[PDB]
Every structure is written in C-alpha cells, then in structure tokens.
C-alpha cells in the first residue's frame, strides 16, 4: 500500500477476542446432569469418561473427567476448568479433581 493509503486506513483492524467455554473466567461451578462415554475420533481408540453439567451461568456443557476412575453421579457439584480434550471433539471443558464432590484419583 502507498503512504497515502496507509494514512487513510491507519492500523489494521483487530477482530475481537471471542470468549470460550468458561466465558473468560478461570473456573465455573456446575451440577452434573448425566454421565456418559464419548468415543475419540480416529486414529485413537478408547471409552473416554465425560459428563454433562449445568454451569453457574445457566448453560449446559460437556466436560471431560480426567484420571483413572471417578465416583461422579447426577446432582453432584464440580468445578470445571478450561482446556480442550484433543481427541474428543466439542469437549472444551474439564473437571477439577479434588474440589467439591469430585475427589482426587485413588492412588494404586
């Protein structure tokens, strides 16, 4: 672009930073609604443990539960955090182990 064209337009317009599943917040608190299994998109093979939750904002999201074995059930309370599960498409939230009803993984 010419110097006249750079002057008439100025600095590049910056698209706004749209928020993610946590809505620009470190964590959210949600109530478990259902516990189910999700299948990782190929080339991976597993039965990943997930749960649906109703977040404090009022929306409902799918959250991956990390660790080997959880005791979560419906009506439990959990603290979710950000971070996508790479193989699980659409799962953009995770549960925090050791907060509210969710507990630390039982060591073997």
Partner RNA sequence: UACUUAAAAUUUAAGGAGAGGGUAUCAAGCACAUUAAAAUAGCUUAAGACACCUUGCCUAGCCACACCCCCACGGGACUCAGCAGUGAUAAAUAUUAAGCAAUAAACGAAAGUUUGACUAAGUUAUACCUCUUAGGGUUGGUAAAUUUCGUGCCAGCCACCGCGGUCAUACGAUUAACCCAAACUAAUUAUCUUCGGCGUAAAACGUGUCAACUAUAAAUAAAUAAAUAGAAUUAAAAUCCAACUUAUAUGUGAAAAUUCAUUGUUAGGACCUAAACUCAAUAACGAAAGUAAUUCUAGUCAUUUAUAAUACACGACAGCUAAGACCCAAACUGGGAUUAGAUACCCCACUAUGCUUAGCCAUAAACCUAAAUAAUUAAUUAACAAAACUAUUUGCCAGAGAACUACUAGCCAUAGCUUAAAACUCAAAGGAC
Binding site for RNA (CB under 7 A): 1-6, 8-15, 17-20, 22, 24-29, 40-41, 43-49, 55-56, 66-69, 79, 81-87, 89-90, 92, 107-108
- Name which of 40 and 101 has its Cβ closer to RNA: 40
* Rounded distance between C-alpha atoms, residue 68 and residue 41, angstroms: 20
Instruction: Pick out residues in 5-64 that bind K ion (CB under 5 A).
Output: 44
* Rounded distance between C-alpha atoms, residue 47 and residue 29, angstroms: 25
List residues binding K ion (CB under 5 A). Answer: 44
């Amino acid at each position: 672009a010419t110097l006249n064209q750079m002057h008439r337009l100025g600095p590049r317009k910056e698209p706004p930073k749209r928020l993610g599943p946590t809505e620009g917040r470190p964590q959210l608190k949600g109530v478990v609604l259902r516990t189910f299994i999700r299948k990782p998109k190929k080339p991976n093979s597993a039965n990943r443990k997930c749960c649906r939750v109703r977040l404090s904002t009022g929306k409902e999201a799918v959250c991956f539960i990390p660790g080997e074995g959880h005791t979560l059930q419906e009506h439990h309370v959990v603290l979710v955090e950000g971070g996508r599960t790479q193989d699980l498409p659409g799962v953009k939230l995770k549960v925090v182990r050791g907060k509210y009803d969710c507990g630390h993984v039982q060591k073997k």
